[PDB]
């Protein structure tokens, strides 16, 4: 450590799959499955060994103009003219698939879906997956911003209005009131140099290995307990991986660019993670059948975690007016949230053919290591 800079050790153990998207989505003309495991070859190595007389056909196959109807796999084109997908000539990586399930009574016509699109995890410039430090620090700006609003408040938080523009301007002023508390001598009091989260430095995670990144499917259970398999296959993580970040606090005085009480907040970090767990989504999780409530130092990380994890709204009917200010012509949420008292209307649970559990759960712990 140091005599004015105090580090910590933030370790995150994932209980469900974790998906941090990169902005990359792969089509079915790049991979092809073998049983359960799906192979991802290198895109340039399988092109270089192919001779030049068939390269004009391989360019017209990936760029779907005619022939295939943009749903054919790689084995549609490579099986007649047998170019062997060898894992030694094309140094890629192969990995398994969690589960595949159909929908319920959607036409009964028993439709069976396939893996048309796969969203990709964010990777290193070498090719290995990792966890950014901008994602974990955005989680800690929801743990601290819910413990000051779920424990106690002056008024219970009500979103004023119906339009989404006044729903926008309420959120950007509650944070700017509860976190711009530095008090520099001659500046505006709502300036970015007054933000209390400039004294917390959350570094990135070390690079993991791609041997454990399975493919999931978004299954939306309801109050009856009947999930449906949406076409949202994505390359997630698997429960069992340990992610270890480093957090550094700064013990300079306030208005010098420091926060002496963020260190005191970080020593009780597993405590506020449990107190926000019992008050926000332990009672919501107990409504849906077949789901067993855990107490835990439970936090939520990454996409596919739900609307409740990324806000600080408390009341269930308060969440429905803001969701009906951006949606509403598809499915009416206002009348449906007062019949079964739930918000949102589904639960993002997954399956790896063995145990049905949630999407994005983690187990949190910390220590004050030098």
């Amino acid at each position: 450590m140091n005599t004015y800079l105090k580090p910590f050790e933030l370790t995150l153990r994932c209980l469900g799959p974790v998906f941090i998207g990169s902005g990359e989505k792969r089509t079915s003309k790049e991979y092809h499955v073998e049983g359960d495991r799906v192979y991802f070859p290198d895109m340039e190595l399988l092109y270089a060994d192919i001779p030049a007389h068939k390269r004009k056909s391989f360019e017209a196959f990936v760029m779907n103009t005619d022939g295939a109807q943009a749903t054919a796999p790689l084995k549609e084109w490579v099986e007649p003219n047998a170019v062997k997908l060898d894992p030694a000539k094309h140094r890629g990586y192969e990995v398994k698939i969690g589960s595949i399930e159909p929908r319920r009574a959607s036409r009964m016509t028993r439709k069976k879906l396939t893996l048309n699109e796969i969203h990709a995890f964010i990777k290193d410039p070498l090719g290995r997956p990792y966890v950014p430090g901008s994602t974990v620090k955005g989680m800690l700006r929801s743990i601290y911003l819910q413990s000051l609003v779920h424990k106690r408040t002056a008024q219970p938080v009500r979103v004023p209005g119906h339009q989404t523009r006044e729903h926008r301007q309420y959120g950007e002023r509650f944070e700017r009131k509860e976190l711009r508390k530095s008090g520099r001598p001659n500046t505006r009091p709502q300036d970015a140099v007054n933000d209390l989260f400039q004294a917390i430095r959350v570094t990135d995670s070390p690079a993991l290995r791609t041997s454990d990144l399975l493919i999931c499917q978004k299954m939306d259970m309801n109050v009856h307990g009947k999930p449906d398999g949406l076409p949202l296959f994505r390359e997630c993580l698997a429960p069992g991986t340990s992610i270890s970040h480093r957090v550094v606090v700064d013990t300079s005085p306030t208005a010098r660019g420091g926060w002496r009480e963020g260190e005191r907040f970080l020593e009780t970090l597993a405590e506020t993670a449990a107190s926000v767990n019992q008050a926000r989504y332990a009672e919501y999780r107990a409504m849906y059948p077949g789901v067993n409530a855990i107490v835990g130092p439970i936090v939520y990380l990454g996409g596919g975690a739900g609307y409740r994890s990324k806000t600080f709204v408390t009341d269930q009917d308060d969440m429905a007016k803001v969701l009906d200010a951006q949606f509403g012509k598809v499915v009416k949420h206002v009348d449906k949230t007062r019949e079964l008292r739930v918000s949102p209307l589904v639960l993002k649970r997954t399956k790896i053919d063995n145990i049905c559990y949630e999407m994005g759960q983690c187990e949190l712990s910390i220590r004050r290591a030098e």
């Binding site: 989505k25 792969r26 003309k29 895109m43 340039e44 270089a48 990936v62 760029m63």
Partner: protein, 124 residues
């Protein structure tokens, strides 16, 4: 060869003919920032090179650029109309080993992202 001598005049007529929705210009400048960061490094090593014929390493880098223009236009409907109208897959086959074919291609490529920002709103 498709690139003219005055390439700035024909690179502007390509952008005026791109397809549009009820708004305009479904193709953005963020959908091809992985194609722009690979082109902007081929331009650097070709400029620093002194010999006229390309290196063997300066042909494996051009050949990797051509597999990204089909792997990005395949998974995007807006990009594949842009590559086929600007003729980027026809010009990359003309560059066998000549250095001045590369620099004429990289000058024409960066005159397309100039008129891509200028001929529309919504980009800062």
């Amino acid at each position: 060869s498709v690139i003219q001598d005055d390439y700035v005049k024909q690179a502007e007529q390509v952008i005026r003919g791109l397809p549009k929705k009820n708004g305009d210009f479904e193709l953005t400048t963020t959908q091809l920032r992985v194609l722009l960061s690979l082109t902007a490094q081929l331009f650097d090593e070709a400029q620093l090179s002194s010999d006229q014929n390309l290196s063997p390493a300066l042909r494996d880098k051009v050949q990797y650029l051509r597999v990204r223009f089909v792997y990005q236009a395949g998974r995007e409907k807006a990009v594949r109309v842009f590559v086929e109208r600007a003729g980027l897959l026809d010009e990359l086959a003309q560059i066998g080993d000549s250095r001045d074919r590369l620099l004429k291609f990289c000058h024409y490529m960066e005159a397309l992202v100039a008129y891509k920002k200028f001929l529309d709103p919504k980009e800062t």
